[PDB]
């Protein structure tokens, strides 16, 4: 059984009329069958105390049930899409609040003794009121985490782009250790320099073009300056009037057109931007993990409250006015969905109906006609009794 | 025909009938609770003017 | 139909019926299809519209 992620020490939600008695061997008490006559390594047989709430018109109960199920779907999707990134960050690999104590309390321990909280919900409140409260709280926390994650993704893309320029090619890297006044003599203009980067093999096209290249060359401006073992760098100083010839010729001898000069106002920009990107990513990741931890427990509290209200409404949906109906919770051994689902429904098959006999049983969606969409507004079909798939 | 549920439906009939009746009773109580002043003070001013 | 009613109104309804003696043809296909008539009653108006 797996409703949550990283299943361990799982439970099940069950409700029933107080007087209801199982039928597999008559004369058996509730605990006698539960704690002893139920196979499984462990069975934390326990009750589930829940406050009573308002009783609206029979007419509406169905629409509130539909609305709460609809919102249950989206909140489930949200908890899933936050758990995925709670592992997608890839910082801690053992676990992260998957089985770790939620709200400083082991998740099974917390739930097996969790009582209802009379802090954001009061004794006499409208059902729509609590529905909207949970809905909007969850929606706001969602939007917050979504915007934060989008900002993190943008930062990751930007810093990756910065890193690619930093390393990935010796032609695109923004040099910051060879530009100097001693080779970029920026003064009263007489010359026009340019950086050159040519593969080693083509070195004859430039070396043997020492001075036949064109007029107006500068002595020591073609001699050895710098070599990267893949490209060779010089400072081709040509005058400030005959730039046209070499500018035209640069497109047929494979010269990099990256116009660079001794200007610190741009050199400092790349370093400051890279360091700031690293620092802001470092701050953002910690802030994001903290926000995830904070909202994680909040969203599970919300989702557990949604399940609680779902079961509470479905209880009266099953039966009449008297809310005297017993609710029990039992821990379940891992990887034992089949036998539990079978035996538990077997003991109270009488509560699946009295004259509605079908060999197919359970609650997994199935179709044998042009119907059976499991929707109380168009097409829905059997349910065994008050219960829902749940592990944690 | 589940014996308990079918009779619970007819019980809820009267239960919610009287619950809505009592909510209507509360509403009509409130509709006049404030009415004991608005008509009992804005109408008595028909005489103080003549007295003055 | 009765099953989907029973499992959409959640096991609470009055539903008794009588069969069509000497049935008649349909209108979509002009076929003498065996027919049944039903009667139903509930309290909720929302139920009625559903």
Structure write-up:
This is part of a larger assembly, with chains A (392 residues), B (52 residues) and C (50 residues). Chain A is built from 8 helices and 9 strands. Chain A is an alpha+beta fold. In chain A, the strands form 3 sheets. Chain A has a 4-stranded antiparallel sheet with strand order 2-8-1-9, with no helix packed on it. A 3-stranded antiparallel sheet of chain A has the order 4-6-5, with no helix packed on it. A two-stranded antiparallel ribbon of chain A has the order 3-7. Chain A starts with 9 loop residues before the first strand and ends with a strand. With 52 residues, chain B is mainly alpha-helical. Chain B contains 3 helices and no strands. The longest helix of chain B is centred in the middle third of the chain and has 31 residues, at 3-33. Chain B is rod-shaped. The N and C termini of chain B lie far apart (77 Å). Chain C is of the alpha+beta class. Chain C is built from 2 helices and 2 strands; from the N terminus they run αββα. The radius of gyration of chain C is 14 Å and the shape is elongated. Chain A binds chain C through residues 57-60, 62-63, 317-318, 353, 356, 371, 376-377, 379-383, and chain C through 3-4, 6-8, 10-11, 43-47, 50. It is classed as motor protein. The entry lists the keywords ATPase, proton pump, rotary motor enzyme, membrane protein, motor protein. The entry is titled "CryoEM Structure of Reconstituted V-ATPase, state1".
């Amino acid at each position: 059984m797996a409703t949550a992620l990283y299943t361990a020490n799982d439970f099940i939600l069950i409700s029933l009329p107080q007087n209801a008695q199982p039928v597999t061997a008559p004369g058996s008490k509730t605990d006698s069958w539960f704690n002893e006559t139920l196979i499984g390594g462990r069975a934390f047989v326990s009750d589930f105390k829940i406050p009573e709430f308002k009783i609206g018109s029979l007419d509406t109960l169905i629409v509130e049930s539909e609305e709460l199920s609809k919102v249950d779907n989206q909140i489930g999707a949200s908890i899933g899409k936050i758990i995925e990134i709670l592992q997608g960050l890839n910082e801690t690999s053992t676990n992260a609040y998957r089985t770790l104590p939620i709200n400083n309390m082991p998740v099974p321990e917390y739930l097996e003794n969790f009582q209802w909280q009379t802090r954001k919900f009061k004794l006499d409140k409208s059902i729509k009121d609590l529905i909207t409260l949970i809905s909007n709280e969850s929606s706001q926390l969602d939007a917050d985490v979504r915007a934060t994650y989008a900002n993190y993704n943008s930062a990751k893309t930007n810093l990756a782009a910065a890193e690619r320029k930093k390393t990935g090619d010796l032609s695109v890297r923004s040099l910051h250790d060879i530009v100097k006044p001693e080779d970029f003599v920026l003064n009263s203009e007489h010359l026009t320099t340019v950086l050159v980067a040519v593969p080693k093999s083509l070195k004859s096209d430039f070396e043997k073009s020492y001075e036949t290249l064109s007029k107006n060359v500068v002595p020591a401006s073609a001699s050895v300056i710098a070599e990267d073992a893949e490209y060779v760098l010089f400072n081709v100083h040509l005058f400030k009037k005959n730039v046209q010839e070499f500018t035209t010729a640069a497109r047929e001898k494979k010269f990099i057109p990256r116009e660079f000069n001794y200007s610190e106002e741009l050199i400092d920009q790349l370093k400051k931007e890279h360091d700031s990107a690293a620092s802001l990513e470092q701050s953002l990741r910690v802030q994001l993990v903290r926000l995830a931890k904070t909202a994680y427990v909040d969203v599970f509290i919300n989702w557990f409250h949604i399940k609680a209200l779902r079961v509470y409404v479905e209880s009266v949906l099953r039966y009449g006015l008297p809310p005297h109906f017993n609710i029990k919770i039992i821990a379940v051994p891992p990887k034992n969905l089949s036998k539990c689902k079978s035996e538990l429904i077997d003991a109270f098959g009488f509560l699946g109906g009295n004259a509605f006999m079908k060999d197919k049983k359970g609650k997994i969606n199935k179709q044998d006609t042009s119907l059976h969409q499991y929707a109380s507004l168009v097409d829905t079909e059997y349910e065994p009794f008050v219960m829902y798939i749940i592990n944690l | 025909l589940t014996p308990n549920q079918v009779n619970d439906e007819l019980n809820k009939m009267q239960a919610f009938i009287r619950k809505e009746a009592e909510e209507k009773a509360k509403e009509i109580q409130l509709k006049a609770d404030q009415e004991y002043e608005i008509e009992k003070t804005n109408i008595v001013r028909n005489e103080t003017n003549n007295i003055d | 139909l009765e099953q989907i009613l029973w499992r959409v109104l959640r096991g609470n309804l009055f539903f008794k019926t009588v069969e069509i003696e000497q049935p008649v043809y349909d209108v979509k296909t002009r076929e003498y299809k065996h027919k049944n008539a039903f009667i139903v009653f509930s309290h909720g108006d929302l139920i009625i519209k559903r």
